[PDB]
Amino acid sequence: GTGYDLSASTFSPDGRVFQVEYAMKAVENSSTAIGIRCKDGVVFGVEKLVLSKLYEEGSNKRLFNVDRHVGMAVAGLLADARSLADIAREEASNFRSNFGYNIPLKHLADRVAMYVHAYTLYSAVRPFGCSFMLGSYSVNDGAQLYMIDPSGVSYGYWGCAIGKARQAAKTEIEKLQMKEMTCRDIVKEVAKIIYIVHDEVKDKAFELELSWVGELTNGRHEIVPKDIREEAEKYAKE
């Protein structure tokens, strides 16, 4: 690159955007996450590195609630990730105010993705350094789960992972047999997969933030009850 990798508005001689090619690297470097579409819902999961015990209980959580039924599990540069989560919340609120009801997940992912692409198109602004899964469930449309990379577009995922170790996670995700497994056993298995992924082999202790959405929660994307999913974390430990 050298000369052409300075502003996203400058195309590469081969025709590539090296600003986004580098913004993907921050997501590749940051800690991982995972999301599996269970049979009747979507279960998230993300290990959070407690960089220092000075911090309180899990804060700056990689999970966020963008709307009543929609959840966002993000990885990468966390500040811009939070700003993007706010963009998503605003988008969902605006859609609910205009067209009523709840925002369909495919359209929400498409709109936030177009917004992200707007931030990589120009020169004055820089591409977002984050990649995130949006997961939602409803009775009408089942469970949907779309992953947005720092510059790319939403894609339908039965199961997806992002962050430090994408391939290591995806191997065991594809080993797991989704589409017939309930969100309970899926909540166990996602913790299992995160713990299979390295947590302390080169790093500190990790916190297991897990999220739910599904008919077992009648929509209403909420963080799984951590007190009762500590046993799921234990089963992962074994």
Binding site: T10, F11, L121, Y122, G152, V153, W158, I173
Partner: protein, 237 residues
């Protein structure tokens, strides 16, 4: 310098930014073919799905811009989606401003003008996605057009775009030079065999996604697995 870094004219008298942006379309690893016919216009692109954790239901590169116009994108998917959204907005806005539906040529002209504005100025950059949009137009038959990151909108009968676009264009040139009109079967079989000869994998009826617009049946039929399988069986016969 910065002749090759910003959208400014080269001292040699060329524009290198758009010249680069065209190669961005080849980047991404995909190809797409469009064949106009005697009465219908059929397009087809390969569906490169790495790993099955994705949703093959939503990985597509063809979209309905309006009730009669169907588009296929080629290049970076983010810019492709942005331009598809822009084209849909233009179609709806045209239908609002003027009563009759937007002709495909006019839509391609507006998209090309947007891209030309992009290659003008220096704050923004051109979008690396070439769009082939087709549709039935009355008093015109089927119509196919291609808007490119530069702003040059044209393309007809047989046009292709992507990595191996030149070989496909050569084969389609041979076929069109062979003077015989394609019916709503020969057109599809021609497109299929063109793309298959370009990327010989014999095309299991799951890795391409074909869109069809006939005259007696308007609308952009994204042909289903069964229909593409039937066409493949009939062709390989």
């Amino acid at each position: 310098g910065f002749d090759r870094h910003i959208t400014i004219f080269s001292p040699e008298g060329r524009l290198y930014q758009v010249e680069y942006a065209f190669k961005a379309i080849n980047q991404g690893g995909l190809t797409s073919v469009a064949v106009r016919g005697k009465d219908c216009a059929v397009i087809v692109t390969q569906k490169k799905v790495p790993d099955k954790l994705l949703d093959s239901s939503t990985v597509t590169h063809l979209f309905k811009i309006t009730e009669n116009i169907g588009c296929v994108m080629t290049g970076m998917t983010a810019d492709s989606r942005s331009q598809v959204q822009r084209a849909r907005y233009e179609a709806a806005n045209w239908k609002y401003k003027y009563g009759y539906e937007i002709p495909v040529d006019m839509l391609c002209k507006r998209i090309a003008d947007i891209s030309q504005v992009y290659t003008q100025n220096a704050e923004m950059r051109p979008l690396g996605c070439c769009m082939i949009l087709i549709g039935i137009d009355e008093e015109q038959g089927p119509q196919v057009y291609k808007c490119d990151p530069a702003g040059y909108y044209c393309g007809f009968k047989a046009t292709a775009a992507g990595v191996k676009q030149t070989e496909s264009t050569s084969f389609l040139e041979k076929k069109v030079k062979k003077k015989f009109d394609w019916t709503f079967e020969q057109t599809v079989e021609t497109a299929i065999t063109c793309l298959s000869t370009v990327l010989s994998i014999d095309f299991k009826p799951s890795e391409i996604e074909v869109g069809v617009v006939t005259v007696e049946n308007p609308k952009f039929r994204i042909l289903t697995e069964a229909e593409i399988d039937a066409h493949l069986v009939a062709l390989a016969e």
